[PDB]
Each structure stands twice: as structure tokens, then as C-alpha cells.
Subunit: 364 residues, 4 copies
């Protein structure tokens, strides 16, 4: 009944019953004879149509807690292009604890069915993924997980709860790196987890309380605050994304463009069926690493950084920053060419962002 933008302002419990304060008090305290974190947990639960919310000290900490739902010998399926925090955690930490990991191209859901082993207990899916924005069918993944008794998990960071709600599609657990869009201001490191399953929430509550990766009260407050403008920020970002893609597809100096809004993008129709907007992450190819380096230097409004989901627009070259550790020829196979540029669209004026990127591409 509440339209989305209204729910962001009035959903969850973010006021103080004791005094009537319209914002949640910051409970910088360790002993009662934490309500600020509880407030942010109720916000993420409401936004994702879940029953239970959990706030961790980082997105990495959220993923670590969810993975610890498993035991030694259990097996997890993940989409084949997981990298960064999540890939390194699973393969360099949790495999030392007997957790077995298999990477599977989930863009075809029957790949999931083939990879299911007797010891499989979890299916973990990012959609869209980083950096090429591969799309996985959430609803079909949920059905497969239910039929085989797997805990289903979606990393919903890139879409945010404003545009995609995996719990409504039958997923067990939805999680976020709230460091990105949710906080939205490049000033809180946090992770968020929501579920509707009472037994899974109890196990999460136990894991959290026993490994202690909790989000502090000041960060909880800044996170609730940033979420208030989530809808306004993603809608501005979405307007710029559409215009930017039109420009990129027309520009001579640009080759392939990667974004789920493009009709020829693999599983474009799947993305439109499970989401009503788009992420602000876009990847596209210029000629080579030298053109990529020239493009970055020629923009006025794009800031060179690896982050995403800021109010400012960000630009990076995956092959030189996030993926420079993979050998070159393997980068080629996976599509991370030397001319691949990734942008995170911010909330600057749309025309300013279109024209700035275009005049910079014109110097190529």
C-alpha cells in the first residue's frame, strides 16, 4: 500500500518511543542495568520484506557469518565470477575449515543442478555480478534450492532493496555490502543481512554473538540516515545510467557495453522480471590500456577509485586494479580486457555526466 519512496521514510522503527525524537538515539554504551543497531536491523528487514535483520561491521563480515551456518565437509555453490572479498574469504579462509566451494556459471540455472553434490548445503548468488554484470534467475534458483534442501543466499548489493527483493522470490537469506548504495555517502563500513526464516535467524544471531563482527552504534546511525535518501539517489542514478548507455553505444571509441538494461545482454528479460530498475555499475571497452588511461585523465567529474555506490561518480580499470592479480591470458578469457573500463554512476547532473564522459571519449 505504501509506495516505495514512502516506505523508505516510514518503514521500520527509527524513532524514539521514550522522548518522541524523530531520529534514533545513538546508544554509545556497552551495559544495560543495542537499540541503535536494532533500528538499522529493522530497517533492512522492512525494506527487504523479511522478518529479521542483522548488522555487521562490514559486508565481508556479513558473508563470513552466513558461511558459518555450515560445517566442515559442507559444500557451497557460487556464481562463477565471484571475486574480491567474497572469493578470497571462501577460498583462503573457509576452505581451511573444511568448507568446500564450487564456482558455477549460474546464468544457466541447470548448471546449478549439475553441480549439486550429496554434501551441498548452500547456494550463494550475486546478481548482477562484478564487473561484467551477469544476471542469474533468482526465482528459479530459489526453487532449485528448495527442492534440494539448500539454504539460498543472494548478495543484493548492486540492486539494493529499492529495485530487487530476493526474499519475495523465495530466497532464504538476502545480504548487502551496506558500505555501497545503502549508506550511499562513502562513510560507513557495514554489512546487512535479512531473512524471514525463524530458525536461520536464530543461528545467525548465535553466530553473530559468538564471533562478534557487530556494527557499532555510530555507524548504525549513519547507515539508517543514508538509507532515507536511497530511493532519491537510485532514481537519479538510474536516469543517468540510461542516458550514459545511449551515449556509449553510439560512440565510435567504445566497443562492448555490459549492463542488464541492454536488450542483447544475456538474461536481460530475466533481470526485468525480477527487478524494476538498474544498478549504477556499467562496464565498457575502449581500445587498450592506454586509451583507458587517457579517458580517465580526460574526465572532469569521474573520480578514480575502486569503490561504488557513492554520491560521486567513480571510474576504474578492472584489469589494472581489482583483477591485476589474475594472469593476463586468463583475464582475456573471462572478458576483463585491458581496455575494459568500469564506472559507478553517482548523483551529479545527468547532462554533466553524459557530456563529460563523451568529450573525454572524443579525445581517444
Amino acid at each position: 500500500s505504501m509506495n516505495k519512496k514512502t516506505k523508505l521514510i516510514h518503514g521500520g522503527h527509527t524513532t524514539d518511543d521514550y522522548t518522541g525524537a524523530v531520529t534514533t538515539p545513538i546508544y554509545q554504551t556497552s551495559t544495560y542495568l543495542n537499540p541503535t543497531r536494532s533500528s538499522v536491523e529493522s530497517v533492512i528487514a522492512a525494506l527487504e520484506n523479511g522478518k529479521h535483520g542483522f548488522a555487521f561491521s562490514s559486508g565481508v563480515a556479513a558473508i563470513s557469518a552466513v558461511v558459518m551456518l555450515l560445517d566442515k565437509g559442507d559444500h557451497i555453490i557460487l556464481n562463477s565470477d565471484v571475486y574480491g572479498g567474497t572469493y578470497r574469504a571462501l577460498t583462503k579462509v573457509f576452505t581451511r575449515f573444511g568448507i568446500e566451494v564450487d564456482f558455477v556459471d549460474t546464468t544457466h540455472t541447470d548448471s546449478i543442478v549439475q553441480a549439486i553434490r550429496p554434501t551441498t548445503k548452500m547456494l550463494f548468488i550475486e546478481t548482477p555480478s562484478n564487473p561484467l554484470l551477469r544476471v542469474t534467475d533468482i526465482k528459479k534458483s530459489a526453487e532449485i534450492a528448495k527442492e534440494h534442501g539448500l539454504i539460498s543466499v543472494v548478495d543484493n548489493t548492486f540492486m539494493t532493496p529499492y529495485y530487487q527483493n530476493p526474499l519475495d522470490l523465495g530466497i532464504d537469506i538476502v545480504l548487502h555490502s551496506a558500505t555501497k548504495y545503502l549508506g550511499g555517502h562513502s562513510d560507513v563500513v557495514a554489512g546487512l543481512v535479512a531473512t524471514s526464516d525463524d530458525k536461520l535467524a536464530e543461528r545467525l544471531a548465535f553466530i553473530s554473538n559468538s564471533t562478534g563482527g557487530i556494527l557499532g552504534p555510530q555507524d548504525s546511525y549513519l547507515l539508517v540516515r543514508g538509507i532515507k535518501t536511497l530511493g532519491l539517489r537510485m532514481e537519479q542514478i538510474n536516469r543517468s545510467v540510461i542516458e550514459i548507455i545511449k551515449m556509449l553505444q553510439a560512440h565510435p571509441a567504445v566497443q562492448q557495453v555490459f549492463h542488464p538494461s541492454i536488450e542483447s545482454h544475456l538474461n536481460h528479460d530475466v533481470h526485468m522480471a525480477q527487478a524494476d530498475g538498474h544498478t549504477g555499475v556499467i562496464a565498457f571497452e575502449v581500445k587498450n590500456t592506454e586509451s583507458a588511461k587517457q579517458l580517465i585523465k580526460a574526465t572532469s567529474y569521474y573520480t578514480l577509485a575502486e569503490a561504488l555506490g557513492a554520491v560521486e561518480s567513480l571510474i576504474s580499470v578492472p584489469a589494472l586494479m581489482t583483477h591485476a592479480s589474475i594472469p593476463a591470458d586468463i583475464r582475456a578469457k573471462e572478458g576483463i580486457t585491458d581496455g575494459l573500463v568500469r564506472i559507478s554512476v553517482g548523483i551529479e547532473d545527468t547532462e554533466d555526466l553524459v557530456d563529460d564522459l563523451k568529450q573525454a571519449l572524443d579525445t581517444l
Copy 2:
């Protein structure tokens, strides 16, 4: 050369080189084109005479990261009376990851030698322990761990770096629940870890960065701030502890008293050899749970809570709060009688704390 109280004010790096600010700026930020946490990490490193410091979102998170130095199949020795956060984490979480735990009465260091298995990799010691304040020989434990290739760890929370420095006794890793004395004001949840071993610090840095239980910048700031008065607070606490114990030992309504300052306490001489002060935690017996309940109600300045290391004095009954989950007859065996009271001495006036507790014991 710097006496202790001076080192608390001038040790580590807690100023801003850029502006000259005499306190560390709070870097509420997620992207650089964290210095507040680095400042608290350099403080704990300096205070413990270590090379490397690490700040976690809770003491529990610090212990979790240290335990993750191990692999499935590895074995850890801990002192037999570990409980609370640490016991539950090891036995209900990490055993699910193949970490094997053995509890050993380390008050006799030869018990450690008997319990060493081919798969043992870590020795973890609290001293003094909770709630009966058992003392373990740190220096001898370090030698045993070195001789058998074990990573040695001391939980140094109860003593603080002001009075006991395990790294100076050959221990590999020292850790704290900074929630207690270090922050000292019941308003920061944090854990701290220090080591001098370069390879162990790298593995800790990797574990921290991959499981993400980091301490936020605002909490880092309040922790540095609270540590400034650590010496003044522990010395006031120590003056009150000595006077309180004199009173308790003389009072008819009091039976056994548990504190390492008492000459008949087991390993009293060991504690004086490895520390130059005392914890503010004291346990003592009254007749029974009813006398314990009456005593708490009769004090004016002791506050009923399970916490410790606050500026206010705290009081609790272990058998009814922290240990009420253990069966009664097992509580009897371990010494947690129904009349066992535990206090955490604060920084109120010493005479006020002595007389208040004595007039309350007089109502028994």
C-alpha cells in the same frame, strides 16, 4: 625510560601530523583516492611492547580472528576455567570447523605438557581467570609453547597492559576485551590484539581483512581517549581493592575470598613475579543465595550488572547470572557456590566503597 603514566599520554601515535591536532581525527570515511583505527592499534602495540596492533569490533571478534590462525584438525589448549564468550565460541562454533579444544588446568604448567598432542598448535591462557581468579605462570607457559612449536596467546584483559605485559615474557600474541578496563567507561565494544611476530601479524592482517570484524572509527576514537586515563583508573581501583580485601577477610559474614593479592592464593608468588599490580575483580562467599541477594540490595554504591572495568563499581552473583546454565552440582565442584559474589571495583572514593560494602555485609 618513560615511566608508565607518562607512556599512556605520549606512547603510540595519537596526534595529527597534517594539522597538529593533539587528538586523532575521526576518519568517518570508506574510500581514499583507516587512520583513526591505526592510531588505536599503535597505542595497544606501544602499551604491550609489541610491534603490531589490531583492533576488532569486540573482544569476541579478536578471539575469533586469533583462533582462525589454525586449520581443521589443529588442536588448542586453554585453561580449564574458560567460560562465557570464549568457551562458547570455541566449542559451539570452531569445533564445527574441525578445531579441537582441550581444557587444561594451567595453574600447574606440567598439565600443559601432558595435554600436548601431535596436532596441537596453540596455547591460550587467561590469567587471572574468571570468576575465581586462577593464576597461570606466563613465562613458563611461553617456554613450553616455544619448545613445542605452539603459538602462545594470553588474554590480558583483567590485568591490562598497565600491570602485566605477556609479550615481555615471551608470549606470541596478547589480546584484550577492550570493552572493559581499556575503554574504561562502559561505552565501547572493542577487542585489541598485539604481537611482535611479523609473520603472525601478516596472517592476522589477512584474517581480519577477509572476515571483516573491524572496529569502527568512532569507537577507535573513544577507545584511544579512555586509555589516556588507564593508569589513573587502575591505580585508584588498586587502592580500593587492597582496602576492600582487608575488610572482607575480617568480616564474620564472609567466608573464602578469591584474589591473587592474598598470600595463600594459589600461585600468589607467580602473579607477583609477572605483574606489578592487581585486577579489580574480586570474588567472595557469603552464606547462601539469600544472603547474596540481601547483600546486593543493601549496598548504596555497587551496581547490579555482569560487566566489569567500568568507572562505577559492579556486583553480581555468578551462580545466578553468568553460570546459571551449568548444573548446580557441577557449580559446586568448580567452586561457584550459591553464596559466591563477584565485584568489579570502580573509581569511587575508597572509604565510601569499603564502608558501603561493610554496612551491607553487617545486615547479614
Copy 3:
């Protein structure tokens, strides 16, 4: 060259040169052997096209400092419908210091010329004013002040720098209650002042430093943060304002509507000449205090409060809250009828806010 939404993200200095942090560090410090406030001062200077910015602990403190530019015996002209903080400060505080105040209906600028005395030194104008949203000709006021040697001041709170820039119209000093739209989240009390005049800025700097109504560093940080979304928030608010007014003008239970967007509003053409958007404050008449009380109880999304510029929509009855101290018959003369309702439009969904207010008016 920078369009507005871009300037909100990249104007002023809000990064750290020392570390590259993309947000301003919070300098919780009192001694250097304040940069967070300086950052917010540079933001307000940039947004208003001024040279110098000043941050005070409240909008009231900003007005107090500006008034102290004068001496005993000096005279100030203000618009006739000033009330609340500003009216009480001038008439109950500064008149005790020999500052003389004359209230003048500035909607006709020739009233200003008639009221100028030999001792007049300042012209102070709110536009639009509260609660009936009277509009004053800023440019003509500036010319009059320049011709008669008066310091010109505009309270630009209701419009924000996003829509109206008095410094560009020749005004000497522009000021804000940043508590409202600029912070935008009902969680910072602050005032902001900008000027381009070097000598006036020096006198302001001296007054501030000598009476000490400074904005703290944490509040400075939250203010900079909230300003990042100012453009997105005011544009959403403006979309809802236009639709709401259409609904109000059509509804049988509504009489007069007060808002500068209405073509018959006095000085409507003046407002469009000096601003390119609208405030989110709207006043309108229902039958009587009972209908007003029923309307408030019948809305789902409007929150009863006296504040304005929040993310949530607010509703109030001036005759019962802000102006209940003026005698009834005087309230009638000035237009503050018992059925006068004032709303502050928030950033909820526009349709939700239109339909909610309409179904509530339908219960009348």
C-alpha cells in the same frame, strides 16, 4: 558551467588532502600544536556564490551574530511578519542593548524607503516568510540598501541555495537555519552565513570568535553530509508541492491556499524572477479549528510537528502552536485564522502524499 546537482557533490572542499579520504575527517579536537567546520563553511560559500562562510550552533545564533554587526542606537528594518526565533531575539534581547527594530511590509519595496531613518544601518528580509509565504523583491531591496548605505541581509532558509541566491542579486549577507532543509534529516541544529564582502566577513569572524556560538565538528560533518542530497530532496519536494497544490485548490473543504507558485499570489512574478523553484512549506485554510484537528487525525503520512525541512512530511496549525500567544483578534487581522493549516512537504511518494491528504480532507 557545473549544473546545480553536480555542484552539490563537487563544490567546496569536502575531502582530506592529507590521506585522500573522500569525506572530511571529524576533528574532535580543541588544540593544534577547526577543519571540519571550515569544510561546511566552504560548502555554504560555494553554494551561495559567496567568498566567506560561517557556521553557528543554531540559526538563532547566526542571526544573533549578524545583528551584533550593529551598535546601540542603530536601527534595523525587517519584514512585518517576522516571528518565532528572530522576532523574539530582536525585541526581547537586542532592544535591551539599544538596537532599534522596525517591522515593515516589504512586499512593497517603497515601504522600505519610507521607514529609513538617519540611524538605520541594516535591512533584514525573509522571503518567502512564515507562515503565509509573503514574497519580497530581493534585487530591489539590495538596490535600496546600497543607495542608503544599509547592510542587506536575506534569511534564505525556506528556498535553500538550490533555488534562490541572494548574493547574486546584490545582497550583502545571506543566512540559513541549516536545521531545516540543508541538513535535511532533523538531526543537526546549525546556522550558516555567507558573504562576499571582506570587511563584513572580518567583523563576523570577530563577533563569532568573541561570543562563541560555533558549530561543533560532529554537527559540521552531518551538515556537509546532508547537503549532498539537497538537490535530490528539494526536487522531490517540489514535485509533490505542485501536485498537492492542484489537489488543494480543487477540494471543496479547502479555502485560501498560500504559496508563491500560485499565479494570484502577491508578488508571484517577483518570486519567479529571483528563484527557479519553490519552498516545500504550504499553508491553507479549512473551516475552523475543529476541522483542522480532524484533518490532522485523518492523515496517515503527515506527522504532527512544528519543524520543517525534514525527510518526512510535517503538519501543524499555526494558531494553536506557533502563534497561540498572539491574541485571537490580532491573529484574524494577520490572516492566521483558526482553520489555517501549515504543511512541510517531505520526500515520500508524491501520489501517496496527494491521496493521503485528499482522503483526509474528504472526512471533513
Copy 4:
């Protein structure tokens, strides 16, 4: 009944009734459908045995509000050696509002009686004063003010409420630059005012609310926190002060020493009658500005700054920093010789501070 150190922990209301939190929540909020500041106001009221407390954004703001209790034409008496913030505010701001100021050497209370005019309304006294630590008889000043119908005010910053309580001596209003000892950590700018007079408190409440120099909630929280250790900090400071003075009085390179603990200091007996400890500010003479410059460079633990009341020990030369604006020959008359050094004793080890300053004086 509560001894001092106990009252610092349990006086005033610094807990949350709603949740039981043992620290005051930080109410970062502007609207209720401020409790953090109220908590710090109740602390200063309790510590000074007053009924009403007021928290301002700076000590300067506290003095400004107290001065605004007066009207144009009213006259204020102050001690002859007021300088810095207070002197500049009164003479460069409030005289422009018709407030008349007379500086009077209050070390002889009969000077006050001679200076009383028909228009005198306020007596304002710092004791001890800066930088030569002149002592004024508080009790006799209060009697004179009562007999002549004057509002009596004491700036109690240098002594803190831990050692001197002017309200108990009949003074109307006591005030502090809480930036110094009360916060104690060089990280809060704040002023505090306490009174027991209901009518004066109402006028202060009105002035505060109308000129808006309020202390923010985060600063209020850090101030309450710092006050918890006030007693431990001042007692450590006092131990070092006594030892340092013994050293200074014995050292060949040192001439006059200025501190109220010295038996030959003017009004030494008065200070002991109205206070039970000492300020940590000490002034002493070396030969000349060159010796002063050499001394500062030769210390290891004294930090060059103009501040006072930090945890670190501070050192400065008044004639080159705070008073370099007064002509040289006038500085000579008032005693601010070129060799005058001022120190603010911190909480480092006493022996470290004695020996460090002595080895530095030995280089002279």
C-alpha cells in the same frame, strides 16, 4: 555524605531510564513529536551544588550569555587582570551595546566597594586569575554583592568544581570553560554555567534559547564522559604541582614563582579557606626570552601550546603568545616579564615531569 570521587561517578543523571543504559544516549536529533545536553547540565549543577545547569558551545558563549543578563547602561566590575576571551568580549563587543566595564584589583575586596556605581549590576571574578594566579576572596565578594544588590559571578575554570565551589560561598552564578579541565582531553569546546537562583536561571534559559549558543549532543556526551575522571586527573595533577614547585623554588635558574600554594603568595590563606586543592597552572621567571626559548626546546615531556587542562603537560611564554599584543613596558608593569614561563601540569608521571623540567632548567 558521598565523598567527592564517588559524587563524580554517581552525581547527576547520566543513565537512560528507558533502557537502563549506563551512559547517556546521544540524541542526535532536532525534533520531538535535548536529553544529552540535559544530562551534562545536571552534572555541572550537582558538582557545584547548584539547582540549574546550562551548557554552551564555548566558555566564551557562556560568558556572553551571563553578560546579557544586563541592559545598556548597566555596569560590571571585573578583576583587573582579566584578559583573553573575556576581556576582548566585554570591551570590544558589549561596550558597543552600552554595557560599561570597570577592571578592579579584587585581591583587596574594599577595591570592589570603591568601584560600585549607581549603575553597577554585576561583579565578575576569576580566581585564581591568568597568568599570575591572583586570588580573590570569594565569600567576601559574595557578601559585598548581596549587600549592594549585585549579581555575583565566579569563573571557576582553573579550580574546577572538584576543589572550589563558589555557590556554597554565596555566589549567584558559577561558570566554566569546560574546554579545559572538565572535558580534560583537549577534544570538546564547551562552556558550563550553574546557579541556584530560580529567577536568574529563567533569564539564562531565555537568553540561551534566544541567542542559541547551545552545546551539541555529541560534545555534551564527551563532556560528561571526561568529567567522570575529573577527580583522578586533578589529584594526579596536584601531586605533580606540589613536587614541581619544590623543584622550581630550589633551582638557581628560576626567579619568582607564582602559585597560590606558596605561603608568601598574596592571599594564600584566602585560597586555602575557599578551596581544598590547587590549579595545575604555574608561572615562573627565567632570565629572559632567550632562556625561556631554550628551556622549552630542552624539555622532553612539556608540549608547546597555549591551552590548559589537557592530559598532557603544556608550556608557553605569555609575553610571546597570549600577551604579545600589550606594549612591552606595560607588560613589565603587570609582571608579564619576557622570562615569564607558564606551564599547565598534565597527568604524566610526577617524577618524569619533575626531572624533565629540572634537566631542562639545568641547560640554562
